[PDB]
């Protein structure tokens, strides 16, 4: 009988709500009221990068903190040189519709996809010298939204078919598959310890998965609309996400509930990308209204603004050493801020 | 030294990218939409993952994409097509049962934030089927549209055919002109199942879209 399961299900939900309410004795804002404010932070564009023909969605800083790869809808993957603004490589793609990009930890590989439903891996250290397609991973039914390298051999990708799958590049078959999401999966982020990872979907929920097991360890809720971004805290024990409700929320795995939310009356448009600083104190988020806002993660007061673009900001990344911040957009011009 | 190598690395790239700029702007991108019953499969086959089709008319290159491998939900990947020159929209006029769902889809595309500037070229297939269906007197546009009882013309076999076919066209244009500011238009056409003039019709409507862009930046409008 479905009714008894629903009656049993809602009873469990009521029990957990009391348990969460029991632990919800205080608030993060109340405790952090005695710390000094960071003040006003101003940032200026140091370098501007151009040659892209069409709009941009993807961007990722390499571990070397110098090279970075950006993908555009005209079918071109370009690797820059931030220090001296030099185009090192320009790879032509088979399918012009590309929605993601990545940079391998060892610097030897890059990856991308979109609507073609195929994950392509490119080799930048070929014996001949040119770049050729190393491998093509397929079985996904929907488009690809994000993909990250665990190492040279293992790659984890999320698709819009409401499932994520872990691949083995050498074998070319799904070693493990992740399910329970009912809506589209739009973004994921690997943990620092490379053991767990989280993915926010279009049903206002983010799930914590165990890579070794393949089962959803925990489920977090609280948003009102689609979730468009997510990222871990530097210590790996928390994450922050932005939604189309135009509010960012910080969750804690141990406390297993929302801690505090950043929002303002004047902001009525959703977030497209979020990221953290090296120390995690400053939370940078890109908005639809062509600007990025620098939030204080511990006080929620807006601390500065970055208003150098005249079109939607779609990507935002921070270097490993925390020396620079890059914010690509649909203008087709990237801009390295500092 | 290392500096000289970097300069040489660049110099070859801009030459290749410059030629890409030349061919890219020459071609026009079009997006094809319809339903399962709508004859978009027939229309694309008329002038013949994503199914690409390239056809050349009066030495201009056109590139049209058909995406059908996705799921029933389309509120996210539709945003990738905000740069197309126009959106071809095919509708079946001879089936009254699901004509309502077509109107709802058309309204959403028209008012979407990221597609406000994109013109729509509207095709109404199955006109031959519509002529036979009405003359039979089995189904009436009236039982699915009470407004038809009080409509007048603004086909030669019987004027009810003209009243019916124009009435369906009138419904689509009413949504178009109700919420607009002359930055994008609709171009309805009456096409049959077997016609060789579809390619020419797309060329003329694309031509008109370009002129209004060129005139506007030159301040003549």
């Amino acid at each position, epitope marked *: 009988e479905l009714d008894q399961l629903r009656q049993e299900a809602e009873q469990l939900k009521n029990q957990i709500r009391d348990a969460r309410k029991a632990c919800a004795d205080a608030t993060l804002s109340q405790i952090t009221n005695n710390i000094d404010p960071v003040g006003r932070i101003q940032m200026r564009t140091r370098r501007t990068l151009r040659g892209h023909l069409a709009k941009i969605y993807a961007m990722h800083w390499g571990t070397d903190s110098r090279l970075l790869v950006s993908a555009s809808q005209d079918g071109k993957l370009i690797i820059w040189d931030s220090y001296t603004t030099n185009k090192v490589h320009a790879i032509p793609l088979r399918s012009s519709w590309v929605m993601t990009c990545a940079y391998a930890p060892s610097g030897n590989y890059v990856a991308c996809g979109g609507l073609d439903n195929i994950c392509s891996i490119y080799n930048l250290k070929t014996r001949e010298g040119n770049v050729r397609v190393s491998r093509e991973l397929a079985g996904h039914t929907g488009y690809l939204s994000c993909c990250r390298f665990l190492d040279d051999n293992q790659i984890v990708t999320s698709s819009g078919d409401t499932t994520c799958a872990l691949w083995d590049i050498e074998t070319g078959q799904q070693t493990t598959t992740f399910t329970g999401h*009912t809506g589209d999966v739009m973004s994921l982020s690997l943990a620092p310890d490379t053991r767990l990872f989280v993915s926010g979907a279009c049903d206002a929920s983010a799930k914590l998965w165990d890579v070794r097991e393949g089962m959803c360890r925990q489920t977090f809720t609280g948003h009102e*609309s689609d979730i468009n971004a997510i990222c871990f805290f530097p210590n790996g024990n928390a994450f922050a996400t932005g939604s189309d409700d*135009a509010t960012c929320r910080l969750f804690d795995l141990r406390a297993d509930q929302e801690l505090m939310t950043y929002s303002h009356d004047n902001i009525i448009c959703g977030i497209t990308s979020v990221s953290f600083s090296k120390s995690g104190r400053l939370l940078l988020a890109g908005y639809d209204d062509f600007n990025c806002n620098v939030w204080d993660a511990l006080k929620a007061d807006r601390a500065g603004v970055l208003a150098g673009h005249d079109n939607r900001v779609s990507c935002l990344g921070v270097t490993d050493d925390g020396m620079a911040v890059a914010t690509g957009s649909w203008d087709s011009f990237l801009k390295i801020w500092n | 030294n290392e500096e000289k190598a970097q300069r040489e690395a660049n110099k070859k790239i801009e030459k290749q990218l410059q030629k890409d700029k030349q061919v890219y702007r020459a071609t026009h991108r079009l997006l094809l939409l319809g339903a399962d019953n709508s004859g978009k499969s027939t229309i694309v086959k008329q002038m013949r993952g994503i199914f690409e089709t390239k056809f050349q008319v009066d030495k201009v290159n056109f590139h049209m994409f058909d995406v059908g491998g996705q799921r*029933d939900e*389309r*509120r996210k990947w539709i945003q990738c097509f905000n740069d197309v020159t126009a959106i071809i929209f095919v509708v079946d006029s001879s089936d009254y049962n699901r004509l309502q769902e077509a109107l709802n889809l058309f309204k*959403s595309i028209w008012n*979407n934030r990221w597609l406000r500037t994109i013109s729509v070229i509207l095709f109404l297939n199955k006109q031959d089927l519509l002529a036979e269906k009405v003359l039979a007197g089995k189904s009436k546009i009236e039982d699915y549209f009470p407004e038809f009882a009080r409509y007048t013309t603004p086909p030669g076999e019987d004027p009810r055919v003209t009243r019916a076919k124009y009435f369906i066209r009138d419904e689509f244009l009413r949504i178009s002109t109700a919420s607009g500011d002359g930055r994008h238009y609709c171009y309805p056409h009456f096409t049959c199942a077997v016609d060789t003039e579809n390619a020419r019709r797309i060329f003329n409507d694309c031509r008109d879209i370009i002129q209004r862009m060129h005139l506007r930046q030159y301040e003549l409008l």
Partner: nanobody, 126 residues
Framework: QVQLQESGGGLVQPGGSLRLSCAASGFTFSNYKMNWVRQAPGKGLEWVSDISQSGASISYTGSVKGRFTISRDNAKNTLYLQMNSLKPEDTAVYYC?????????????????????RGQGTQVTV
């Protein structure tokens, strides 16, 4: 979390009337455009009517004009539909969908098979 609970359906003789009410919780009701949808046996989802944010704009499907009236009370955060002179073909299961994103005037994917923000549904038979 977003939750929508429905009630009101039961057996009624032809030509009767029924009152359908849905309660919404977990979000600001005032900012969202609400819809009504139904599914007849052995058929796909069908659209019935919708109401704007403040109720200024109202629309109905052609097959039910002059028989159904849609109203919303933002104060108590509910949606309503009053049905009069029901026909034999009106039997179906009625769900209460909702617009996807806050503030836009477009309602994509509302009639999709697996829409996230939708109610459990109430059966109505004649």
């Amino acid at each position: 979390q977003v939750q929508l609970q429905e009630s009101g359906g039961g057996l009624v003789q032809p030509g009767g009337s029924l009152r359908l009410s849905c309660a919404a919780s977990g979000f600001t009701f005032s900012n969202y455009k609400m819809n009504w949808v139904r599914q007849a046996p052995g058929k796909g989802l069908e659209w019935v009517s919708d109401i704007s944010q403040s109720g200024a704009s109202i629309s109905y499907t052609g097959s039910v004009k002059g028989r159904f009236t849609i109203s919303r009370d933002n104060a108590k955060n509910t949606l309503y539909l009053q049905m009069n002179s029901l026909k034999p073909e009106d039997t179906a299961v009625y769900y209460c969908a909702r617009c996807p994103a806050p503030f836009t005037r477009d309602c994509f994917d509302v009639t999709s098979t697996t829409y996230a923000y939708r109610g459990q549904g109430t059966q109505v038979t004649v």
